[PDB]
Coordinates of C-alpha atoms and ligand atoms in Angstrom, one line a residue:
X1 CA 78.2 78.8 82.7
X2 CA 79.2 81.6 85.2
X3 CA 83.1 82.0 85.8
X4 CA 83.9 85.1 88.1
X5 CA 86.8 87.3 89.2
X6 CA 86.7 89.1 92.6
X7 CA 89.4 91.3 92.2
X8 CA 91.3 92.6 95.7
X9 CA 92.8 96.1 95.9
X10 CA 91.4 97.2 98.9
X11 CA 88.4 95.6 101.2
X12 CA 91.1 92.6 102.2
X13 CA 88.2 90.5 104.3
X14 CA 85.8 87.9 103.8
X15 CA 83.5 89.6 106.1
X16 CA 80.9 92.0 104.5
X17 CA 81.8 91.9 101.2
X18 CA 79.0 92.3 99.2
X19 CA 81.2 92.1 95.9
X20 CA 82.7 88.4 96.6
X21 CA 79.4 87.1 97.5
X22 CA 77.7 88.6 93.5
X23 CA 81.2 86.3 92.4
X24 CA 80.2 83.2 94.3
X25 CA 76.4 83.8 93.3
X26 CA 75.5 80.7 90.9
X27 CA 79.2 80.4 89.6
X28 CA 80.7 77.5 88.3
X29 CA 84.4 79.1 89.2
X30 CA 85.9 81.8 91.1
X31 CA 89.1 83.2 90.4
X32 CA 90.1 85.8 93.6
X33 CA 92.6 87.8 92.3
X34 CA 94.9 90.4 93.8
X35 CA 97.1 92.4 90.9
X36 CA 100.9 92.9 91.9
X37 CA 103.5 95.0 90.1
X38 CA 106.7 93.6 90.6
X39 CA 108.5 96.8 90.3
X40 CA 106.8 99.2 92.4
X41 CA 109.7 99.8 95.1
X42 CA 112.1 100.2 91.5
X43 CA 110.2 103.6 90.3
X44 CA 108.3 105.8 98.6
X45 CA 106.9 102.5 100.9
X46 CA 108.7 101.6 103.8
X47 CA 108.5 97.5 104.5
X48 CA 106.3 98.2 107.5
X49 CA 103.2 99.2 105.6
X50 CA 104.5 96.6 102.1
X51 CA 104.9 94.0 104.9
X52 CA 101.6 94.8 106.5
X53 CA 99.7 94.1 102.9
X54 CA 101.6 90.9 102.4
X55 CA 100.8 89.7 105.5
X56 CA 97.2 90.7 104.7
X57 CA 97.2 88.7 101.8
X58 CA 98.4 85.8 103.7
X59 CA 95.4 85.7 105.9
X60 CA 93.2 86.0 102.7
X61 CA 95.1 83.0 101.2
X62 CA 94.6 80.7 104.2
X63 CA 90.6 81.8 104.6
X64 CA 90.4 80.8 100.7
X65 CA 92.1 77.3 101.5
X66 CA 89.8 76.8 104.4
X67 CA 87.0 76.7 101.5
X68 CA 88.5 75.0 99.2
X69 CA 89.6 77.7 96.9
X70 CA 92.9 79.7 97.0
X71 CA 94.2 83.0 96.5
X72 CA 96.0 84.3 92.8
X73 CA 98.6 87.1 93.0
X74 CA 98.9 88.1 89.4
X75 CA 102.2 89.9 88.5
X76 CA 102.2 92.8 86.3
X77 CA 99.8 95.9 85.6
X78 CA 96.0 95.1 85.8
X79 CA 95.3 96.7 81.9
X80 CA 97.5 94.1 80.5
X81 CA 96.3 90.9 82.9
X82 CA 93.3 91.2 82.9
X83 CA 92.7 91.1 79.1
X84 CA 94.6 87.7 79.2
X85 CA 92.8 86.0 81.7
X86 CA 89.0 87.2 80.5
X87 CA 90.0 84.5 77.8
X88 CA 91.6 82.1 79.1
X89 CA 89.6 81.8 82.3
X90 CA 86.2 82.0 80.7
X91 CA 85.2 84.9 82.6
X92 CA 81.5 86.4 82.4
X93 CA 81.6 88.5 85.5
X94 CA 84.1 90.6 87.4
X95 CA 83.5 92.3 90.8
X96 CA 85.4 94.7 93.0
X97 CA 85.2 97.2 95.4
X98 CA 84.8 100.7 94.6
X99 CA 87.1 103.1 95.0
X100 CA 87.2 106.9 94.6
X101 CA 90.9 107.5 95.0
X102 CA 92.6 109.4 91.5
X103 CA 94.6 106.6 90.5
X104 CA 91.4 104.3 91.0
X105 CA 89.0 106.1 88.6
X106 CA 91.7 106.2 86.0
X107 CA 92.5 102.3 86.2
X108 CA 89.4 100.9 87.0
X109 CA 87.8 102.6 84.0
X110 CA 89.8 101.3 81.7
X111 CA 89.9 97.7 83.1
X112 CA 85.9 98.1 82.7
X113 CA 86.5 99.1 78.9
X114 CA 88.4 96.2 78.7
X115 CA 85.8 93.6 80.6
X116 CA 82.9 95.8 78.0
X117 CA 85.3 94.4 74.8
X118 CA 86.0 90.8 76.3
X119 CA 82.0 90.9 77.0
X120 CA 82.3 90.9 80.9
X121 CA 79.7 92.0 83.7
X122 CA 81.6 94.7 86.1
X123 CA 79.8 94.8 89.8
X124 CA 81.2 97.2 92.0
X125 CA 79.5 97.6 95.0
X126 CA 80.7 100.2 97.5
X127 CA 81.6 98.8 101.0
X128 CA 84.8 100.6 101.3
X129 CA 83.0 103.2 103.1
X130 CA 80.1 103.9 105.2
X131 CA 77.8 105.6 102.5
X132 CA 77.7 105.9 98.7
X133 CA 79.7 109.3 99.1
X134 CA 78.7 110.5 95.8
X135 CA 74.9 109.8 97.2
X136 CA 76.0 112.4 100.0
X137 CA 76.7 114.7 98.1
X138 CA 73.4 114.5 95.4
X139 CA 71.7 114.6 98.9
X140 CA 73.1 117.5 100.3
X141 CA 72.6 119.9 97.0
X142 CA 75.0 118.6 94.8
X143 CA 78.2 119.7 97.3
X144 CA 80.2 118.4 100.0
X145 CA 79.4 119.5 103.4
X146 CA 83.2 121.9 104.6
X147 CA 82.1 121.3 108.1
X148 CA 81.4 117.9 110.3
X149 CA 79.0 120.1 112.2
X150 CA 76.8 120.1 108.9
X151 CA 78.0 116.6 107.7
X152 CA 76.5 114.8 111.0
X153 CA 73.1 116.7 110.1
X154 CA 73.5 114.7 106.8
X155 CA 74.2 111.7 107.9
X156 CA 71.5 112.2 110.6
X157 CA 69.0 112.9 107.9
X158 CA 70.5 110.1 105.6
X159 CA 70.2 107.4 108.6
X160 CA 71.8 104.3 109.0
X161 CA 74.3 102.9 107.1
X162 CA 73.5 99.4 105.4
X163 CA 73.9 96.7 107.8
X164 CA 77.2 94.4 107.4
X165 CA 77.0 91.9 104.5
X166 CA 76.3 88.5 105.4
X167 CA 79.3 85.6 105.6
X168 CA 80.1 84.0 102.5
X169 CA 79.4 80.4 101.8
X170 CA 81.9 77.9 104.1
X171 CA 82.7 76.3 100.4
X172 CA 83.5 78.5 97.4
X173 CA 83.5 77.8 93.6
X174 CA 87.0 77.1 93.5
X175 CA 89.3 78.4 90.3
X176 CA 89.7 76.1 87.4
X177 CA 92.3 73.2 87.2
X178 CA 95.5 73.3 84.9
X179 CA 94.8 77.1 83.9
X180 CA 98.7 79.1 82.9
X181 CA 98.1 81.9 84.4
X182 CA 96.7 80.1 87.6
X183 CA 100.3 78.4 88.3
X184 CA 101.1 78.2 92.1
X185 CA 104.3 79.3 91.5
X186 CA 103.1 82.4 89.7
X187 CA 100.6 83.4 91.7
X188 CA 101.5 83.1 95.7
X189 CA 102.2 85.6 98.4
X190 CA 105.6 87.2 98.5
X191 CA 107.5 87.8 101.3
X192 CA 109.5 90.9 102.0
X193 CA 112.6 89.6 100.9
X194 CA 111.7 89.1 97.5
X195 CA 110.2 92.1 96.6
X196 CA 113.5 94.1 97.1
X197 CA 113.3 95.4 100.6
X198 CA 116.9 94.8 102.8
X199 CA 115.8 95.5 106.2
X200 CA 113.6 93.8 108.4
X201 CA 110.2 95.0 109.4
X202 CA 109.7 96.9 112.8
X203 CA 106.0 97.2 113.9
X204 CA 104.3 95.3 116.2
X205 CA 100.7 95.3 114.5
X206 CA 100.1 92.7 112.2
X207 CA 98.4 93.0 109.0
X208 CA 95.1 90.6 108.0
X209 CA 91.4 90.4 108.1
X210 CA 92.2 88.0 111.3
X211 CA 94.1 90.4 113.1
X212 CA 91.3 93.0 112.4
X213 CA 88.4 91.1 114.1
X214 CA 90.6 90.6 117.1
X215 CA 91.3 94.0 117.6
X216 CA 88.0 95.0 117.3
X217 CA 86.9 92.4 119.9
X218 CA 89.7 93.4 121.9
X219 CA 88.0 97.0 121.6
X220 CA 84.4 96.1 122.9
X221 CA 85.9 93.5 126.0
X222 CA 84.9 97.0 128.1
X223 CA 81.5 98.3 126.7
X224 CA 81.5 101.3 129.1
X225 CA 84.7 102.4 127.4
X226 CA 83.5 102.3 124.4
X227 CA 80.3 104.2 125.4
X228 CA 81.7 107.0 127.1
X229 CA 85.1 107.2 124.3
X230 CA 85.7 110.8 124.1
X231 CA 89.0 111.7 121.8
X232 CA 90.4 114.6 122.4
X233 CA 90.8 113.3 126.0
X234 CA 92.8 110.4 125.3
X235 CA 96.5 109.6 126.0
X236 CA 99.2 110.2 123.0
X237 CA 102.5 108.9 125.3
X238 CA 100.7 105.4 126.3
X239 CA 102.4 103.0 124.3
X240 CA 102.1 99.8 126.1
X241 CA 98.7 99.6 126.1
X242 CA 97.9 102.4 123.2
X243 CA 95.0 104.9 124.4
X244 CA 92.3 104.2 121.2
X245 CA 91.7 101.2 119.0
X246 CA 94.7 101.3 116.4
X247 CA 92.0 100.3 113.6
X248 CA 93.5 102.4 110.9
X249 CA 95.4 100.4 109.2
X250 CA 92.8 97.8 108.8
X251 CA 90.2 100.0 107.4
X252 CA 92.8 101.4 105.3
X253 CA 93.4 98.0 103.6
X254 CA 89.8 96.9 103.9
X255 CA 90.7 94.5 106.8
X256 CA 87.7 95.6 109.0
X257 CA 84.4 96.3 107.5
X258 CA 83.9 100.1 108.3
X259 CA 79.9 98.9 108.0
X260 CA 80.7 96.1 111.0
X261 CA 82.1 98.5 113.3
X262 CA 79.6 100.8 113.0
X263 CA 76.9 98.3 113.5
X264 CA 78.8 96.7 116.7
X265 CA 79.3 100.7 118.2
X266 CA 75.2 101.1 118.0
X267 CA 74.7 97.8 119.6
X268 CA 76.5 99.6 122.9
X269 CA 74.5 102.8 122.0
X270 CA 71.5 101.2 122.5
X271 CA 72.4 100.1 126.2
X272 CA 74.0 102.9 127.1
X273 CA 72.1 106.1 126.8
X274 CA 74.7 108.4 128.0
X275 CA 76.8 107.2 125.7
X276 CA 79.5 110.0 123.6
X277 CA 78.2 111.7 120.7
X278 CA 80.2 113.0 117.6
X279 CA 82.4 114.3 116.6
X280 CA 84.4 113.1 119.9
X281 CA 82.7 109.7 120.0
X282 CA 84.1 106.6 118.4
X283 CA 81.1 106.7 115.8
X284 CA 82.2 109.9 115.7
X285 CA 86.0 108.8 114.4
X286 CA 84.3 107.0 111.4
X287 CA 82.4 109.9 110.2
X288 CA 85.8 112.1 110.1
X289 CA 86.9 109.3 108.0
X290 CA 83.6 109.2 106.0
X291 CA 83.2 112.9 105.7
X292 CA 86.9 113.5 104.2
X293 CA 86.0 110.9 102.1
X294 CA 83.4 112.7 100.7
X295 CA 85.5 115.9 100.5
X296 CA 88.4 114.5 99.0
X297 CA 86.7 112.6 96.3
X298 CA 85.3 115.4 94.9
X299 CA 88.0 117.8 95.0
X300 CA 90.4 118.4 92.3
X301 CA 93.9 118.4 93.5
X302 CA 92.8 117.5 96.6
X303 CA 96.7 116.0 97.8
X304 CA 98.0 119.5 97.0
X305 CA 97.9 123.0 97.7
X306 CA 98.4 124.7 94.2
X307 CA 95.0 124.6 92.2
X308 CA 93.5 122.9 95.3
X309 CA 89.9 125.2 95.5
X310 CA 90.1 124.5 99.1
X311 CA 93.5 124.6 100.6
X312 CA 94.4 128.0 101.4
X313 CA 97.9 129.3 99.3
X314 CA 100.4 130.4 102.4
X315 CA 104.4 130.7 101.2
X316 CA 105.9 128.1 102.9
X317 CA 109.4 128.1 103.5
X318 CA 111.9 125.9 101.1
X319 CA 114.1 125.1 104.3
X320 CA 115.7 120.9 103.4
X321 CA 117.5 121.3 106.5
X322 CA 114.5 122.0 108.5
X323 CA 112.8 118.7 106.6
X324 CA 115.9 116.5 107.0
X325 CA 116.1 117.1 111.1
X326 CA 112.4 116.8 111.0
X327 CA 112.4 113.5 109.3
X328 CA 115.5 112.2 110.7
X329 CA 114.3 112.6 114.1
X330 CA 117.0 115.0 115.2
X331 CA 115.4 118.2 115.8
X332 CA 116.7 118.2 119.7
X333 CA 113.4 118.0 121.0
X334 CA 112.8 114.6 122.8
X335 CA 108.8 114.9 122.5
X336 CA 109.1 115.5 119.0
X337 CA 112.6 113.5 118.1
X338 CA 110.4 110.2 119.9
X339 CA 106.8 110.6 118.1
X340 CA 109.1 110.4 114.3
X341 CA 110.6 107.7 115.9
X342 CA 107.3 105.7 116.7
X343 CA 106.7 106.5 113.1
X344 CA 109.7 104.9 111.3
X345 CA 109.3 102.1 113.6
X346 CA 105.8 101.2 114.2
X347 CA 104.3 103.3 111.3
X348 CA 101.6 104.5 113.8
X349 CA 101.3 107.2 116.0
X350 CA 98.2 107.8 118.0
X351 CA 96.3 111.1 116.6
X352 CA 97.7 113.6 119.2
X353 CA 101.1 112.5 118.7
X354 CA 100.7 113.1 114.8
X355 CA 99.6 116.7 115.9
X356 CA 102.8 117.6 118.0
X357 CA 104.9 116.9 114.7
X358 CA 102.9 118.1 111.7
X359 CA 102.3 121.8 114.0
X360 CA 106.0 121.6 114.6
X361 CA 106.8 121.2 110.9
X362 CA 104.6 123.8 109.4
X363 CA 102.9 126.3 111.5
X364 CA 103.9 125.5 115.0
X365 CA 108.1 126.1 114.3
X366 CA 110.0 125.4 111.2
X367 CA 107.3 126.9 108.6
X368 CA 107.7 124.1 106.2
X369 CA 105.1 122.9 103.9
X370 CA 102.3 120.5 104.8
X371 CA 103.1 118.4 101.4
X372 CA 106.5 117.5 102.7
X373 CA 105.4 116.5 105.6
X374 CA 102.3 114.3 103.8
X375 CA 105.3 112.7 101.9
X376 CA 107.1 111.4 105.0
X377 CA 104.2 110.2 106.2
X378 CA 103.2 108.7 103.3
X379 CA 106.1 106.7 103.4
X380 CA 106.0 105.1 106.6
X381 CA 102.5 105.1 108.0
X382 CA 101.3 101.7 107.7
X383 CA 97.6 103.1 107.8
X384 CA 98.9 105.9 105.0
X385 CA 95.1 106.6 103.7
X386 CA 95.4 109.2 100.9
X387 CA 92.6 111.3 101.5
X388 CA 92.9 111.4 105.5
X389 CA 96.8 112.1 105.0
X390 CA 96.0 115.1 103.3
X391 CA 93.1 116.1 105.0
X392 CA 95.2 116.3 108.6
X393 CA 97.9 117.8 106.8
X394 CA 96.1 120.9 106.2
X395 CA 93.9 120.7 109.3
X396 CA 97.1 121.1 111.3
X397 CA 98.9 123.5 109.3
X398 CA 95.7 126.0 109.0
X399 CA 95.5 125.3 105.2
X400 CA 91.5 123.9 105.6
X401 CA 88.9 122.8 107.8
X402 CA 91.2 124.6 110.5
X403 CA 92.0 128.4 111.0
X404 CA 93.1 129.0 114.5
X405 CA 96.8 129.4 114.1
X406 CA 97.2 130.8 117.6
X407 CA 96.8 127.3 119.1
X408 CA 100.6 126.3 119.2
X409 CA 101.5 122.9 120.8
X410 CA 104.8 123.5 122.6
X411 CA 107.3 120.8 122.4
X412 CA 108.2 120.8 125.8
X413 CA 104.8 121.5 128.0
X414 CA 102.6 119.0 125.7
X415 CA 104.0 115.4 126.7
X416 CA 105.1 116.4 130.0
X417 CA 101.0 116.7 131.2
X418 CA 100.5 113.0 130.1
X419 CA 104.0 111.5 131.0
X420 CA 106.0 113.3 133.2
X421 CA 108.7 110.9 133.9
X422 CA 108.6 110.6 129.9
X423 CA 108.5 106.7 129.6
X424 CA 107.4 107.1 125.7
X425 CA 110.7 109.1 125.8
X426 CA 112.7 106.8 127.2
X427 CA 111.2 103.8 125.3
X428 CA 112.0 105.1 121.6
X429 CA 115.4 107.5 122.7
X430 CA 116.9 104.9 124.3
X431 CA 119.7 107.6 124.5
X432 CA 117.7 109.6 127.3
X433 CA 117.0 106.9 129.4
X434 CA 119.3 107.5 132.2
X435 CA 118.1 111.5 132.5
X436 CA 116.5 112.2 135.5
X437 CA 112.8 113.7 134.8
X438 CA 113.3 117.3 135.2
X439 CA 115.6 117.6 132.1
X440 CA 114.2 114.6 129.7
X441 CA 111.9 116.7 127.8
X442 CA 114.9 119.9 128.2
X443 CA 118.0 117.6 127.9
X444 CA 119.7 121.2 126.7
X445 CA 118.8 122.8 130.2
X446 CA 120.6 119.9 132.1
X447 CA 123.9 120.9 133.8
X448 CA 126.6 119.3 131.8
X449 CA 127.5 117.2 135.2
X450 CA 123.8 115.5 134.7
X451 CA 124.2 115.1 131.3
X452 CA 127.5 113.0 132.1
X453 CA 126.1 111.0 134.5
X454 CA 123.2 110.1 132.1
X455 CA 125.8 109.3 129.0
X456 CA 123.6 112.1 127.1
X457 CA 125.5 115.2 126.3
X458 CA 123.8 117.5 124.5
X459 CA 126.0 117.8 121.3
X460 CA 127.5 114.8 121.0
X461 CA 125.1 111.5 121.7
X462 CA 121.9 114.3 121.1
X463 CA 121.5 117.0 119.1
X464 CA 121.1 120.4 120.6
X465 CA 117.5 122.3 119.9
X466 CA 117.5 123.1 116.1
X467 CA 115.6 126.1 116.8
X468 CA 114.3 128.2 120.0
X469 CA 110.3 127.5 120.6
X470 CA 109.4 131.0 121.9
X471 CA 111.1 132.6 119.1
X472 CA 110.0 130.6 116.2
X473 CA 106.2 130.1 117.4
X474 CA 106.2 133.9 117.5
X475 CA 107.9 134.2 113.6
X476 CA 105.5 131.5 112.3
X477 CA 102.2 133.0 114.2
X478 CA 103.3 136.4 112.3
X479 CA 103.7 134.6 109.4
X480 CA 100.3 132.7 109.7
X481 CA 98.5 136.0 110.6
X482 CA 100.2 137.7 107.2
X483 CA 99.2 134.7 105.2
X484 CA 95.5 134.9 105.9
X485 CA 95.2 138.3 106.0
X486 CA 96.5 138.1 102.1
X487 CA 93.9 135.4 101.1
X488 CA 90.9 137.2 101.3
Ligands
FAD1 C1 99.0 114.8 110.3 C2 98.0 113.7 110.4 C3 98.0 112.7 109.4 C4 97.1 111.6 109.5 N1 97.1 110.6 108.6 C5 96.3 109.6 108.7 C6 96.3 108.6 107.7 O1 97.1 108.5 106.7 N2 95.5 107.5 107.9 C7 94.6 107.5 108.9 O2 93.9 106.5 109.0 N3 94.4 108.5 109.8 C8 95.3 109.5 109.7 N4 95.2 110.5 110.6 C9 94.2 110.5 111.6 C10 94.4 109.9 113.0 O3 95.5 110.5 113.6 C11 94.4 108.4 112.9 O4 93.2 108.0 112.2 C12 94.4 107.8 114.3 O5 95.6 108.1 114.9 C13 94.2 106.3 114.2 O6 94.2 105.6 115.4 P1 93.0 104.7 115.9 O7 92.7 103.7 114.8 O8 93.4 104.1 117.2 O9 91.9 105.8 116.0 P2 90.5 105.8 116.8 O10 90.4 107.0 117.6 O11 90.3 104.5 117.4 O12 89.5 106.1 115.6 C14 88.9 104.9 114.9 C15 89.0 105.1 113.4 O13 88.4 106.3 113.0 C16 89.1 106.9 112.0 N5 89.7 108.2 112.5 C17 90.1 108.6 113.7 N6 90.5 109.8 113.8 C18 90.5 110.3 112.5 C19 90.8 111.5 111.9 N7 91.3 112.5 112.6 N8 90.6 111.7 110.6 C20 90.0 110.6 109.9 N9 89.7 109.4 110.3 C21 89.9 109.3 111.7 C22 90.2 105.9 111.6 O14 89.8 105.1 110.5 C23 90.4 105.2 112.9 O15 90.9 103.9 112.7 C24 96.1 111.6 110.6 C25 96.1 112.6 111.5 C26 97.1 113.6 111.5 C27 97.1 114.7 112.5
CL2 CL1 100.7 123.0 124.6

């Protein structure tokens, strides 16, 4: 008789899911299994994105129970569970989704030595992204395309991506009764609190498979918007109603099928023949995600600049008290003090926003390095995805993809062309709230009788300017200019 494991790390859904629906397929029991260490925070995460998984795992839980089967959070490290269960569960087949992440290839090969000794079938479909990346690249010459201008022409040439998987059955196999390691109280979903974390989440997105259809729903309510979604044009300081979808961190967890939203955006493409076109189109969004993807996975030391073949090697300043302002939100720029902000409180920033402060960490101003900066946001970006981190990371600081290191966002001018009055300002430095709107993105430039008035002086409730614009965009250009003239 058939007893299965559908193993969760990413691809958190029910929805296509071509690797739980091999698990249900003729099985007499199916064990859905998500493998948690216990000590991860004790060796980094902010609760917002730790928060955001355990919430996801609370939706998967309660879509189990509504078929009669039920969701086992394993403690401890998947090459010494999994050996365990094979046994005592009976297994004959395990299924999961691929992954091409480092620290994937190196555990999932040896959980599939250890389902090879325990006599075990591994399935791993790929539905984590749009393609089979490594197919990409086989079609392409054996390389990555560098350029999206290229990559669309593959994909073009490719076609389609496979259609969504269908819904699994409304009743599942369910797991076996009386099994140890299938205890309830060893196996349910944690909350914050007892993982280690102190203080209370912050963000306003919620994490789940759930919350992920209802966004995307949200997203097509106004078809024409979709249609005519063009990127580069949208908002960065709208907050209250934020200015794109805020789907990253459900495809980052696998909450939304990446296959689903792209078969929902043709749908509209079809009725609207006008409709954007990559890269600035909303299709065109998934294929940056798809085509760094395919870049990442096949470059060594992708997450790095040393021995990283295509990061270029610039010196960057070892400055910590550039860093610390940076990541403390105190560099006496309000545009720039607000967007860090946003991101220790929400853990999401739209994509604009995430350019004012990663140019104004390493090329724009302070000349640090983009891996300090892919820390932080590692950290606390609930939609942290390893390979697009990095990716922006050296897009913005001119290390790949991007060399025009004379474009230099200011941190005054930038914001003030969307919001003028600076309401994003105002919303996450409450200490600027009473500044009249001709000094809120200058606070320094306010006479000191404003600055009274408004309960902000400039030196003691905020910080003065930690560095002049002007004069450090012009060191850092010189910099940038010296730098690639050196790697030739
Ligand atoms: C320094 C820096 C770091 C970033 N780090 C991350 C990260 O860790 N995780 C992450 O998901 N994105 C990252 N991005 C990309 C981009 O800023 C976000 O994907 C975007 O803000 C997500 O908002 P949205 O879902 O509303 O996007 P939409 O515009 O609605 O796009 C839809 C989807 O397309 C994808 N997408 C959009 N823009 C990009 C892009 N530039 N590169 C790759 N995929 C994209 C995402 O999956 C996104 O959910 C980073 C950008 C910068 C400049
Ligand atoms: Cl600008």
């Amino acid at each position: 008789v058939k007893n299965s494991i559908i193993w969760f790390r990413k691809g958190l859904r029910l929805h296509d899911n071509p690797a739980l629906l091999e698990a249900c397929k003729d099985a007499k029991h199916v064990y859905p299994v998500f493998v948690l260490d216990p000590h991860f925070l004790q060796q980094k995460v902010s609760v917002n994105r730790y928060n955001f998984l355990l919430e996801s795992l609370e939706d998967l839980q309660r879509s189990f129970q509504a078929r009669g089967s039920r969701l086992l959070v394993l403690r401890g490290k998947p090459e010494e569970v999994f050996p365990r269960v094979f046994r005592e569960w009976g297994v004959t087949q395990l299924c999961f989704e691929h992954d091409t992440e480092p620290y994937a290839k190196v555990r999932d090969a040896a959980v599939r030595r250890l389902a090879a000794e325990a006599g075990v079938e591994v399935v791993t479909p790929i539905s984590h992204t749009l393609y089979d990346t490594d197919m990409l690249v086989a079609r392409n010459g054996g390389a990555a395309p560098l350029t999206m201008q290229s990559f669309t022409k593959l994909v073009d040439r490719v076609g389609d991506p496979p259609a969504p998987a269908p819904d699994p059955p409304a009743a599942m196999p369910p797991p076996a009764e009386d099994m140890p390691s299938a205890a309830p109280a060893a196996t349910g979903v944690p909350t914050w609190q007892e993982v280690g974390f102190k203080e209370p989440p912050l963000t306003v997105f919620k994490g789940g498979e759930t919350e992920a259809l209802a966004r995307l729903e949200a997203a097509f309510q106004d078809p024409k918007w979709v249609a005519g979604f063009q990127k580069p044009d949208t908002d960065p300081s709208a907050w209250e109603k934020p200015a794109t979808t805020v789907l990253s961190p459900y495809l980052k967890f696998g909450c939304l099928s990446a296959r689903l939203f792209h078969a929902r955006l043709l749908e509209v493409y079809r009725r609207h023949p006008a409709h954007s076109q990559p890269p600035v189109s909303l299709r065109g969004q998934l294929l940056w995600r798809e085509f760094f993807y395919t870049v990442g996975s096949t470059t060594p030391n992708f997450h790095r600049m040393a021995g990283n073949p295509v990061c270029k090697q610039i010196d960057w300043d070892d400055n910590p008290e550039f860093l610390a302002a940076w990541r403390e939100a105190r560099t006496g720029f309000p545009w720039i003090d607000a967007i860090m902000t946003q991101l220790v409180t929400w853990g999401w920033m739209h994509h604009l926003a995430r350019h004012s402060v990663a140019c104004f960490l390493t090329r724009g101003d302070l000349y640090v390095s983009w891996e300090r900066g892919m820390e932080v946001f590692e950290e606390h970006l609930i939609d942290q995805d390893h390979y697009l981190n990095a990716a922006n990371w050296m897009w913005l600081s001119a290390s790949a993809f991007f060399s025009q290191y004379f474009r230099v966002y200011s941190p005054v001018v930038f914001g003030k062309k969307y919001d003028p009055e600076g309401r994003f300002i105002r919303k996450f430095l409450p200490v600027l709230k009473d500044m009249p709107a001709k000094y809120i993105y200058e606070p320094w430039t306010a006479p000191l009788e404003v600055q009274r008035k408004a309960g902000c002086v400039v030196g003691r409730d905020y910080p003065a300017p930690i560095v002049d614009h002007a004069v450090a965009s012009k060191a850092c250009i010189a910099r940038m200019a010296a730098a690639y003239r050196r790697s030739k």
